Amino acid sequence: FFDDKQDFLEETFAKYPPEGRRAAIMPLLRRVQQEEGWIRPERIEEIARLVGTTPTEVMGVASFYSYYQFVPTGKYHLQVCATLSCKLAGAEELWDYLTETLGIGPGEVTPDGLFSVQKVECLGSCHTAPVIQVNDEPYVECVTRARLEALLAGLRAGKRLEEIELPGKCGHHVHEVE
Amino acid sequence: MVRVKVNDRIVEVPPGTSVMDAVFHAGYDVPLFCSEKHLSPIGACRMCLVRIGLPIQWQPKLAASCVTAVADGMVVDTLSDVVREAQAGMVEFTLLNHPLDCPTCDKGGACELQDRTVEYGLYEKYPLELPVYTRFEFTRRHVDKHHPLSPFVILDRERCIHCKRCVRYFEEVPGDEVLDFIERGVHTFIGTMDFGLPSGFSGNITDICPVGALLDLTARFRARNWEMEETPTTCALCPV
Amino acid sequence: TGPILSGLDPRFERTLYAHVGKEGSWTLDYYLRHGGYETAKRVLKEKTPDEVIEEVKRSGLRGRGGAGFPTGLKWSFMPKDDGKQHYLICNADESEPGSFKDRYILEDVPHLLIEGMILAGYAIRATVGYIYVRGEYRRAADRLEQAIKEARARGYLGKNLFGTDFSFDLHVHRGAGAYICGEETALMNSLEGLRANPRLKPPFPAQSGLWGKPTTINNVETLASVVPIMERGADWFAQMGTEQSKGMKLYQISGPVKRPGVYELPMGTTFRELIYEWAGGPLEPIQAIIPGGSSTPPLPFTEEVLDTPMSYEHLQAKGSMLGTGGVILIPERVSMVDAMWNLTRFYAHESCGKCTPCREGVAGFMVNLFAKIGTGQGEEKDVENLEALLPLIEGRSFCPLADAAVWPVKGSLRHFKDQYLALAREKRPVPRPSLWR
Amino acid sequence: ASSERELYEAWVELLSWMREYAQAKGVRFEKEADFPDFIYRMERPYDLPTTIMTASLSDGLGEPFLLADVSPRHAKLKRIGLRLPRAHIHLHAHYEPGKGLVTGKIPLTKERFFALADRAREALAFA
Ligand SMILES: Cc1cc2nc3c(=O)[nH]c(=O)nc-3n(C[C@H](O)[C@H](O)[C@H](O)COP(=O)(O)O)c2cc1C
Ligand code: SF4
Ligand code: SF4
Ligand code: SF4
Ligand code: FES
Ligand code: FES
């Protein structure tokens, strides 16, 4: 996987001391994740060999965080924040509706092949709750039913999120509720 | 040397001593799961908890005697009602998810968990009160069981109490990190992506594991710990 | 007015969030045209590291990560000369609920933080710094990398800064979404490439940190606040807040309120002022408030509470604490049982597992008690059990995560044990009204 | 309530599904643990249809890629749980009357379980 990009390896390992190469496991894992959708044992062995430690160590590291997926995920892995604020904004009913409509569990993916679901803790934007993240992108905030369904249909028709029309206004650091 | 007092007794003790070792050097006792001889103590089981005074100036919270250094003229309390109550509670937390295998467990009579349980647990609360053994009435952790990690070692991830002994050893003493935890929270379990167990010293984790998680495949289901006759001798396979 | 800043007095100067929101605020040219880097440029050649440490010690700047340790005396613990390389660590992992203040600093005004880190690194003789950001903030990370690229291009991060014999450079490190990685000793492991389990503290990070080097870790808000301090007075900074809570603070609020969000306000503003004047007043009747972060104990919605100044002392003497200033209002429409339900399930998800007490008791026991209660299965026996469980976890863990889990439930019982016993004795699930549109 | 009986029946049903997938795909299935309330029951009666509490699907190397468990006969908050090791993936199935076995609100069909197991095999299985 990293055979292709040795310049990226040099760039990331140069960020860390020569004896601290094992630091680079994080950026290497993150590149594999964001590029292929999920982390394979081969990716973990390669990270280990490049970074100078054991595949067991690298697997222990990788399996420590929630972001790292070890099973295939759909083109859009909906990470739904369920923490207290977002629940007080209805994250419960949001997750219930999404999961029941799509018919998917957190581990599996829609038969369409582009929709996976997952719960996540505080995304650090509570004033604009409820919150959802799509696989790398700045949160789709102020999640109402209409905003959710519009994002859903837009992604269903292949429109790139960065250019999708989103009803309603989302405050930057403060937001007026009416 | 450093002057310590354990609950009624006075001890001379070298400066770099652990509070736990000062305790046992005074002849007292305290639960012990995470720490091990020749291994780095790190407070994980939180079993070695004692009281410390350094003036009457008692510390606010209990000191982990395994990772607490000793200071000159320090008081250590292992008999306080609160100390024994906390010991029993930690024992209960450790027993929370255990698989109920004692009779069929190859760890048999010599299980540190069993013994520290019967030593320190079920503190005397105050009559002929009818007491309860377990308060936890929910589903226990159920994970992979009796998994051969190698031709010599079997792994019961349910019996693991998530101390650090085996991974700590693997990192420190042989220098072969061929065992580590995978997930976190209560989902933590021991695994490896180096499956053969390459290290030529893997079998010691079987002796170290305070529970029946890591057991000896070459001697599995042969006899119970007390039943065996022990012949202490020396190995003549090589000149060490 | 008699000189003390405790609110909307007109002599307060917006410094930190001033350029936040303005388009193109992340351009180095914007930062310069508004006077950026002047403070670093002056201090690096004029003041010594001991002097910039004493300046913050005089400012009385306490840790903005939620602890509150005085950063001046904190820097006074560094070796201050050893020959070893030191590292300066920026903690951009903002994972506690109700706290969203550092996000927009990173997204819109990165060069302020960069200047503050240059100042702190000069203070602590750290020639390199790492900024460990959580893997959920990608816009902030892009803006930070871009700003660092800009500073490296135009010479603000270089071999020698501004002719003086000091050297400085920063490197970004993205995380992967684990709350425990915010604990400063687990963050070091996470970056180094281990599992993010905390280290043994008896060896302190001031004398042994990242790769053994004498590293110092500071909050993003702290480092950003270093720049105004050095720019226009330490007394100008100390002109805000109570006798023990000096300077300004970025308060943030969320919940059923008219306009939640971030407000850069002096220390001591009342809950009444914050919720009504700024947040526009609630939208529903509130049963309780969680002032500091998620970990802070909820206090009832009372007049004597709303009139209490948010500070490190007035909340202390009121039983709660001011951790991050992130207020969350809990209305009567949602059960406290359900609130602490979600709180304990989140803390159970985010435990690392090293401690048997935290791992097992929280992730198996406490969450299951709340489940039984709020699913219409609980008993008064269960409420008493849950009541007695907390002291066995609170006192003794390797890292305070266990305490941050038990304390909110502690205060929730102390103020609403009635609710728990009610839901138990009626075998009633928590109320489930429709909250989202 | 009386949901327990049909819960253990559907538990036996899910075990049958696991055995069938194992035989079809030629992958190892394992009965991991039996009921302590059946082992240590000496004279005490046992009304449950089966005595098996835990099972798993292990790859050629024996490391599991799919784990399934049921709550004991005497525990509170009875459920059935599924887990993908190394994937931080956990599922909690209940039984709703008339509908059937459901993960939350989403019906848990044999086809759903087969798709989940196939994905788990292809991703997690080392050999
Ligand atoms: C379990 C745990 C998690 C924490 N997570 C964070 C965090 O995510 N972000 C943060 O700024 N502080 C966090 N803290 C508090 C840190 O100690 C704080 O960032 C650090 O002390 C910075 O010091 P300062 O405020 O003086 O700059 C956490 C503390 C604990 C115990
Ligand atoms: S590990 Fe110890 S306590 Fe557990 S089943 Fe075996 S003998 Fe019993
Ligand atoms: S397998 Fe044994 S030695 Fe290893 S962590 Fe678990 S209880 Fe400790
Ligand atoms: S208190 Fe919990 S999160 Fe903290 S070190 Fe212990 S087990 Fe890990
Ligand atoms: S609670 Fe969901 S963003 Fe903080
Ligand atoms: S014995 Fe000290 S904590 Fe394990």
CSV table of C-alpha atoms in Angstrom, one decimal, chain B residues 24 64 142 144:
chain,number,residue,atom,x,y,z
B,24,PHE,CA,5.5,-7.3,53.5
B,64,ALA,CA,-1.1,2.2,45.6
B,142,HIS,CA,-18.3,-13.6,27.3
B,144,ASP,CA,-13.4,-16.4,23.0
